[PDB]
Amino acid sequence: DAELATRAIPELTKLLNDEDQVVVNKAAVMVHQLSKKEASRHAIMRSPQMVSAIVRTMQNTNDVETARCTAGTLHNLSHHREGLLAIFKSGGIPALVKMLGSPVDSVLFYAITTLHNLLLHQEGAKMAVRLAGGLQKMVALLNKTNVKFLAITTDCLQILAYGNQESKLIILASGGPQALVNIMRTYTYEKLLWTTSRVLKVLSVCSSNKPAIVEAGGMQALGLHLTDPSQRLVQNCLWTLRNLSDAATKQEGMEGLLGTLVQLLGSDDINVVTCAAGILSNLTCNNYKNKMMVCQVGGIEALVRTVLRAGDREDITEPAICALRHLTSRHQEAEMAQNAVRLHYGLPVVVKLLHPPSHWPLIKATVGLIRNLALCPANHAPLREQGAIPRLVQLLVRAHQDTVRMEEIVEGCTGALHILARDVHNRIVIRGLNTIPLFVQLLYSPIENIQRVAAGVLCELAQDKEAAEAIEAEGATAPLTELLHSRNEGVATYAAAVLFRMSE
Ligand SMILES: O=S(=O)(Nc1cccc(-c2ccccn2)c1)c1ccc(Br)cc1
């Protein structure tokens, strides 16, 4: 069987080396229609004699029936690791990519099939096509229409992406993302969407290029398939949107995407809820154009319940607590969003997350959220009767006695007593825990924003009579008097307003 070509092989090599571009064309066809034999393709393989001659004849031809059979051999040889090694050694890779510069898809399919098999098999072939300029062509090859073609070209761009930060920018340089997301908002085929998603997912793991797909509409197109029945896909369409969320904060025309996300917060896979609660956190950090869209679709309802699903788990807790904070500061439906937390029974599950086993970053967002919630004074009465002002004042000491920075809490944990002191009974509860020496201690901090919220909870506290008969001791009727000269002005204002309500 195979003992035939094992000696007839060197014959066909010589006739390939000939000059006449007809005694080499149809001669190479003889090699192909023999490669259809798993017994004798082994013989073409085992001896890498013409393995160069096939490669060499490919990039030195002008007839199309040549390349139809020429590269087809290279395909029909990728079926075993034995052959792959020969194709790399024979310099085929910086030549197989030249066939990507053809319109005849019969050549292109046979070509990109080999390049796919090499990457997901042949070691040491990544550095190859990276340098044969194929990163350009593979992108520019995303004009064709044969679903399975673009489903392979996108995958060959995945391996050539997960690795070097430099291989991506070629994709960022020539159409790339704007031609990529086109494959996501025009094609029904499922496998191609998943293959394309891993590309867009990999491209989104460095802030250097994240603001490129977003301007290309990547958030919009990726929002189309969030509901797609292929669950093995949506988990890629989500991790991408979580990384991208640092760019669409200042982007418009993206509304309905949120509406499909706020719904997913009550789904089966706890994975999706986690990434979904994160997608809404960074899509809200400083932008009251998305916020109002989240509220009028029941965002607060969807989040309090989601905060209540887990509780002890913190992968869910942070991006939802840190979300509700964004939906409770500087926007139109502010007061309503501060109300809606209470009506939907939020106050408990919020103050509960102050207590352990919760760790520091969640406690940051929670403390900031309680400052936010206290703006509608209806929220004061429960927080007082919820066991909150204590665990605030202790957390402050936990972050104080040793002075993310604990000082970032000392500010927010005091600045939440300032929006809490605007209620009458809470000023007694603060006064009751015998804390006035600590707020006075804070003023001496020569930092900055800590100066403000310190005097803030004192300025609110001193409106009553007995605070003058208390803060005037301990050592305040002088350090504030040597603070009015502060460069910061809201810091000076507060540092003075205390000094007033003390004389009479
Ligand atoms: O608790 S944070 O959200 N930390 C934190 C940690 C990692 C990332 C970010 C972040 C990334 C992108 C966009 C907004 N945020 C914030 C925070 C908030 C305010 C201040 Br002042 C300091 C830290």
Author numbering: 145 to 547, 564 to 664
Question: What is the paper's account of this structure, in its own sentences?
Answer:
pmcWingless/integrase-1 (Wnt)/β-catenin signaling, a pathway that regulates tissue homeostasis, evades its tight control in many human diseases. In physiological conditions and in the absence of Wnt ligands, the pathway is kept inactive by means of the β-catenin destruction complex. Activation of Wnt/β-catenin involves the binding to TCF and additional co-transcription factors. In cancer cells, β-catenin promotes transcription of the oncogenes, Axin-2, c-Myc, and Cyclin-D1, ultimately promoting the growth of several types of cancers, including colon cancer, hepatocellular carcinoma, pancreatic cancer, lung cancer, and ovarian cancer.
With the aim to elucidate the binding mode of 9 within the β-catenin Armadillo repeats domain, the crystal structure of the complex has been determined at 3.4 Å resolution from apo-protein crystals soaked with the ligand. The ligand, which can be easily accommodated into the final 2Fo-Fc electron density map, occupies a solvent-exposed cavity resulting from the curvature of the α-solenoid superhelix involving the Armadillo repeats 7 to 10. The cationic side chain of Lys508 strongly interacts with the ligand through electrostatic interactions with one of its sulfonamide oxygens and with the cation-π attractive force of the bromophenyl aromatic ring. In addition, the heterocycle ring of 9 forms van der Waals contacts with the side chain of Asp390 and Cys429. Three structural water molecules actively contribute to coordinating the binding. In particular, a water molecule mediates H-bonds between the second sulfonamide oxygen with the sulfhydryl-reactive group of Cys466 and NH of Arg469. A second water molecule bridges the side chains of His470 and Cys429 with the nitrogen heterocycle ring of 9. Indeed, these two positively charged residues are typically involved in salt-bridge hydrogen bonds with Glu17 and Asp16, respectively, playing a key role in Tcf-4 functional binding and the transcriptional activity of Wnt downstream genes. The crystallographic analysis of the β-catenin Armadillo repeats domain revealed that compound 9 and Tcf-4 share a common binding site within the hotspot binding region close to Lys508.
